[model samples]
Target: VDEPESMVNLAFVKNDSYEKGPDSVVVHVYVKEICRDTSRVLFREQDFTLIFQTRDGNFLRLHPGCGPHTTFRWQVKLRNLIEPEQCTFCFTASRIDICLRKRQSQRWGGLEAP
Candidate 1:
């Protein structure tokens, strides 16, 4: 397969309403279509990543002679540590919602640390 001529980064929003010392952070991602079966997620003590395969679009290919790569990915390093086991996520019509549980109650100036 051939790599898509272009790539589109998924757009999303973050709600740090808990910026003032809270237990969790929330994020919402918007996508028109996705292949849930092949898509995947990665969560860590201080990081989060998402992979999505759209219903229609250019698939990524590692080599001209090889099959397309699995999916597109989005990732971020959080401002603070999180309890990965306590995190949760859901997919809705054109959107993805995530609740990240903080490892400790504290204030996060922003979504990502400097």
Candidate 2:
């Protein structure tokens, strides 16, 4: 019999207006997977990488995987930020070909906003 595929879930907070400031942005990530056999699961804290990118080409890196079936939250503060814009967050799974689910907030405060 063929084995079933595993599933992963991810969620994040939405930002209506992202403005440049000393305060950092916080993101919550969740991951869950179900394998056909418990022995088939091989996930570790060092197999995930989080990437943060701004609309202006700026980017940040974060690692939020340390526990299994646990929630991972990360906070990032921008230095010398002078503009309001939208940023993109991405999570990549290493060594594993499992599917990933992602969710993001709508574009918030920016120079283009009236």
Candidate 3:
């Protein structure tokens, strides 16, 4: 599953001394890559599909074991980079989009009733 990984400049950074108050969860915009060259499709898909998504914590704080509970491919792993809780997993694609499926629940998406 050596998919050409897709990662955006998406980042969530905590406010510092210089910056005062704010609203909602503000994401940092690192709109520039070192460029020059660069650039995973595995198990399926002609274009990029979201492999998995996680958020900023002490890694397993959202799970019971090693990896997240996502199933059917999106449940893949970024196993090592777990230190930063806001870590996500996916492969890069030309034109891509993802459902902002962050909120948890016993609702549709993949949550069970407690």
Candidate 4:
């Protein structure tokens, strides 16, 4: 029995897009969106925001929390972006749908030649 501040944003936006061969970009960053419910859905938002928009428009956002943090690390690490296959890094309270691509991971070390 608590929380007039029934929080949201368990943290989101993570794709680490990659491929390094074909190309796929867009990483992270958001201001805030936790301290909601000040007076019904937080008055449609005054500051706390978790936004994202790509496809060349490029516009990501995030901001929330005054002090006691529950977990709003809010990411931001976008790069390349020449080819974001089906790019979908949208962030909305509990609606964090992700998919920038598994898109980057290089490592080959076994060793067998001396």
User: TM-score for every candidate vs. truth?
Assistant: 0.59, 0.18, 0.17, 0.23
What value of lDDT does candidate 2 attain over all alpha carbons? 0.29
lDDT by residue for model 1 (65-107), tens: 2223435667777876888888777777877666777776675
Residue ranges of candidate 2 with Cα displaced over 4 Å: 1-69, 82-114
Which candidate ranks first by lDDT, i.e. highest? 1
lDDT of 4 by residue, 28-67 (tens): 3332333342212111111123422222112222423323
Candidate 1 Cα lDDT to native: 0.60
Query: Model 2: which ten-residue window has the lowest total lDDT?
Result: 52-61
C-alpha lDDT of residue 62 in model 2: 38
lDDT comparison, 1 vs 4, better candidate: 1
Report the number of backbone clashes for model 1: 0
lDDT of each: 0.60, 0.29, 0.26, 0.34
Over 16-101, each residue of candidate 2 has an lDDT whose tens digit, in order, gives 32323423333333322322123132223223333222111121123233222222232333233312333334444412222222
Per-residue error (Å), model 4, residue 60:
22
Best by TM-score: 1
Stretches of candidate 1 exceeding 4 Å from the true structure: 1-21, 56-70, 108-114
Model 2 residue 88 lDDT? 37
Compared with the true structure, model 2 gives a TM-score of 0.18
C-alpha displacement of 75 in model 4, angstroms? 5.8
